[PDB]
Amino acid sequence: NLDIIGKRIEKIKQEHETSWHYDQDHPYKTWAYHGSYETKQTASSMVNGVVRLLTKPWDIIPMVTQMAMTFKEKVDTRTQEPKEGTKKLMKITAEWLWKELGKKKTPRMCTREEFTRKVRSNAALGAIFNKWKSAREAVEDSGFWELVDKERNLHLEGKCETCVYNMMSRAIWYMWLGARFLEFEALGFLNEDHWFSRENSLSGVEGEGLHKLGYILRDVSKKEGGAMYADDTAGWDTRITLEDLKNEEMVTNHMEGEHKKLAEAIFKLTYQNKVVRVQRPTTVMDIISRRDQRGSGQVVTYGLNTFTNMEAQLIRQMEGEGVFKSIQHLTVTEEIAVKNWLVRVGRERLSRMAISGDDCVVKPLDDRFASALTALNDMGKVRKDIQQWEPSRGWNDWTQVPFCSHHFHELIMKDGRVLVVPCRNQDELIGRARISQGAGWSLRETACLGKSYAQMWSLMYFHRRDLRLAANAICSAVPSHWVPTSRTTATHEWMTTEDMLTVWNRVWIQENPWMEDKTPVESWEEIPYLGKREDQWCGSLIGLTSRATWAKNIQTAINQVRSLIGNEEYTDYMPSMKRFRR
């Protein structure tokens, strides 16, 4: 308690000594409250005019238009302590899993240079604005690194002064750039050295790319076993127990020297003890603390969520296979039974899964898994949108399974070769491409963001008639040499000024390990679409009068946007499509 968090609390108390008051009408029940102080401030979603002017038919579709308009009673709930049997299963599995992930990898510190390079090419390091303007300026100033140095030596001494979260089914925990650096230095290796790649972790998909995920799910489907299960957890980050954070910290058992001490301090001082500041309109700032739940940088959050989800799903697989009888207590005989299962079949059981943070697909040995719920519920990983003891419903066809907000189609090229393509309802894709975040967008910056969406559609969603057409229109409307941009940056192969047919060939043919015949495609007309009825099922407007008028008159829409941008060099990409090819 206050020995570890008191120093951070003390320091904030004094900077607002004028305003400090133990408010008696504080809304917190599960968060430990400390005090309040005076503040006054808040970032809505803005429309991308380039994408909207080239998608006119969607101006009258509420599922698109409503996306641009506009639970903290889940952060303030509690999780119960797991039973002794559950605690044993988790400790044994976590010990085994860190060793497997560690066999071909070496834990190491990430560098100031690595951190600096990340800030100098816009990575979302969930930092706050103050003594320097942006992250880019702090990183160039030697005074910043001296503050970093002070905190760093405090961590080596087992104490913390400035690593405090700022809060804002979503929740982001911004920290000052310094606290973020010390997290990256100690635990960045998990992401930087690809500990959750599929090659290294067998279940993971880190670095895989949306063009690989369907092929990975089809490979899982080829295993003998039962249905494919894809159960979503209700509020995963809020269900991370103190036992989970202790099993995650066991990665430090694999470290040495300074690194070991710096990592032990991140886990002890910032993860297993948290200090948070939250805006309340009654506008004050509340200083609250708690020991459990996930509150880390988004990239460390992804790797540890993947770790703890792999652990939870192996234990659910053990329960289905009858490796243990009850979560109340494991016998030392069962303990040897659990380790032996892991040693003999653990790697095979990991390969039956695709796990992306809180998102999983599992093809178990048989359907006993569906009703194997005692460990999953007792670990706190309660399933969304199903009663606690109702058996999971599985998917009989890998093309139906949801994963990473997509489903996947098997698409046969005119030449016989097989593509496995990503897909989701087309209203979601169009509605997201019509939105920007933040202020001060020039017309050129807005155009270059529209071009990023268009080139993503050409590479990932070429099989959707409306998106191939709208992608060609946007790329025709934006100057040919203008570089696609994002402010917030899987593999993003569409982020390039290379010809999109050349990139398509590289991604789907040359580098595709599921494609034996490497014969290049010579034109976009060789690249297939879904069936027309399937395209409509997944939200196409093909068949509507509004869509036919848009497609027929597309050069008029392209010319409207070119006239706004002005006298620039443009390319016509529409004749890459059969219907505009004379």
Ligand X SMILES: O=C1CCN(c2ccccn2)CC1
Among 50, 163, 227, 478, binds Zn ion (CB under 5 A): 163
3-state helix, strand, coil in the chain (%, to 5): 50, 10, 40
Interaction of residue 331 with ligand X, rule CB under 6 A: no
Cβ 353 to ligand X, closest distance in Å? Answer: 16
Residue 574 partner contact from ligand X, Zn ion, none using kind-dependent CB cut-offs of 5 to 8 Å: none
- Residue 108 annotated as binding? no
- Using CB under 5 A as the binding rule, the residues of this chain from 189 to 228 that contact Zn ion are none
Exposure string over 395-411, b if 16+ CB within 10 A, otherwise e: beebeebebbebbbbeb
Q: What is the DSSP track for 362-417?
A: E--SSGGGGG--HHHHHTT-PBSSS-TTSPPPPBSSTTT--BTTBEEEEEE-TTS-
The angle that helices 177-187 and 112-119 make with each other, rounded to 10 degrees, is 120
Widest pairwise Cα distance in the chain: 78
* Choice between 375 and 401, CB closer to Zn ion: 401
The mark string for 57-96 relative to Zn ion (x by CB under 5 A, - otherwise) is ----------------------------------------
- Residue 235 annotated as binding? yes
The stretch among 57-65, 319-327, 386-394, 510-518 that binds ligand X (CB under 6 A) is 319-327
The stretch among 162-170, 310-318, 381-389, 561-569 that binds Zn ion (CB under 5 A) is 162-170
Interaction of residue 322 with ligand X, rule CB under 6 A: yes
* Choice between 363 and 463, CB closer to ligand X: 363
Structure tokens, 254: 């694999």
Query: CA-CA distances (angstroms) from residue 34 to 2, 31, 276?
Result: 10, 10, 10
Under 8 Å between Cβ of 551 and 469: yes
- Residue 236 annotated as binding? yes
Cβ 99 to ligand X, closest distance in Å? Answer: 18
| Residues shown for the chain | 582
Give, in degrees to the nearest 5, the angle at Cα 446 between 442 and 451.
Answer: 145
Q: Tell me the one-letter amino acid at 418.
A: V
Interaction of residue 160 with Zn ion, rule CB under 5 A: yes
Residue 110 partner contact from ligand X, Zn ion, none using kind-dependent CB cut-offs of 5 to 8 Å: none
Cβ 322 to ligand X, closest distance in Å? Answer: 5
Interaction of residue 369 with ligand X, rule CB under 6 A: no
Give, in degrees to the nearest 5, the angle at Cα 296 between 293 and 300.
Answer: 115
- Residue 305 annotated as binding? yes
The stretch among 53-61, 102-110, 149-157, 226-234 that binds Zn ion (CB under 5 A) is 149-157
The stretch among 287-295, 338-346, 389-397, 494-502 that binds ligand X (CB under 6 A) is 338-346
- Strand 284-290, strand 353-356: pairing: unpaired
- Residue 407 annotated as binding? yes
Residue 539's H or E segment, with its range, is none
* Choice between 321 and 511, CB closer to ligand X: 321
Residue 249 partner contact from Zn ion, ligand X, none using kind-dependent CB cut-offs of 5 to 8 Å: none
* Choice between 12 and 330, CB closer to ligand X: 330
Interaction of residue 534 with ligand X, rule CB under 6 A: no
Whole-angstrom distance, CA of residue 277 vs CA of residue 173: 10
- Residue 232 annotated as binding? yes
Interaction of residue 321 with ligand X, rule CB under 6 A: yes
Structure tokens, 530: 């879904």
Exposure string over 510-524, b if 16+ CB within 10 A, otherwise e: eebeebeeeeebeeb
Structure tokens, 567: 């006298």
Phi, psi at residue 274, to the nearest 5°?
A: -125, 145
The residue of the chain with the least Cβ separation from ligand X equals 344
Interaction of residue 423 with Zn ion, rule CB under 5 A: yes
Whole-angstrom distance, CA of residue 277 vs CA of residue 167: 6
Under 8 Å between Cβ of 454 and 474: yes
Cβ 444 to Zn ion, closest distance in Å? Answer: 34
How many other CB atoms are there within 10 angstroms of residue 326's CB atom? 14
Cβ 347 to ligand X, closest distance in Å? Answer: 11
Interaction of residue 345 with ligand X, rule CB under 6 A: yes
The stretch among 133-141, 286-294, 318-326, 500-508 that binds ligand X (CB under 6 A) is 318-326
Among 9, 167, 242, 337, binds ligand X (CB under 6 A): 337
Cβ 335 to ligand X, closest distance in Å? Answer: 12
Exposure string over 552-578, b if 16+ CB within 10 A, otherwise e: eebeebbeebbeebeeeebeebbebbe
Under 8 Å between Cβ of 229 and 392: yes
- Residue 163 annotated as binding? yes
Cβ 398 to ligand X, closest distance in Å? Answer: 25
Structure tokens, 542: 């093909």
User: Under DSSP, is residue 320 helix (H, G, I), strand (E, B) or coil?
Assistant: helix
Structure tokens, 14: 């004094």
Whole-angstrom distance, CA of residue 308 vs CA of residue 292: 14
End-to-end CA distance of the chain: 74
Interaction of residue 344 with ligand X, rule CB under 6 A: yes
- Residue 539 annotated as binding? no
Among 340, 489, 549, 563, binds ligand X (CB under 6 A): 340
The contacts of residue 79 (CB under 8 Å, 6+ apart) are 238, 239, 241, 292, 380
The stretch among 124-132, 232-240, 339-347, 532-540 that binds ligand X (CB under 6 A) is 339-347
Interaction of residue 341 with ligand X, rule CB under 6 A: yes
Among 186, 467, 538, 541, binds Zn ion (CB under 5 A): 538
Q: How many positions of this chain bind ligand X (CB under 6 A)? A: 8
Cβ 334 to ligand X, closest distance in Å? Answer: 9
Cβ 394 to ligand X, closest distance in Å? Answer: 21
Q: How many positions of this chain bind Zn ion (CB under 5 A)? A: 5
Under 8 Å between Cβ of 500 and 451: no
Phi, psi at residue 279, to the nearest 5°?
A: -80, 125
* Choice between 135 and 175, CB closer to Zn ion: 175
Among 310, 323, 353, 375, binds ligand X (CB under 6 A): 323
Interaction of residue 333 with ligand X, rule CB under 6 A: no
Structure tokens, 350: 């990991």
* Choice between 340 and 502, CB closer to ligand X: 340
Annotated binding site for CTP: 170, 235-237, 305, 384
Binding interface with ligand X (CB under 6 A): 321-323, 337, 340-341, 344-345
Binding interface with Zn ion (CB under 5 A): 151, 160, 163, 423, 538
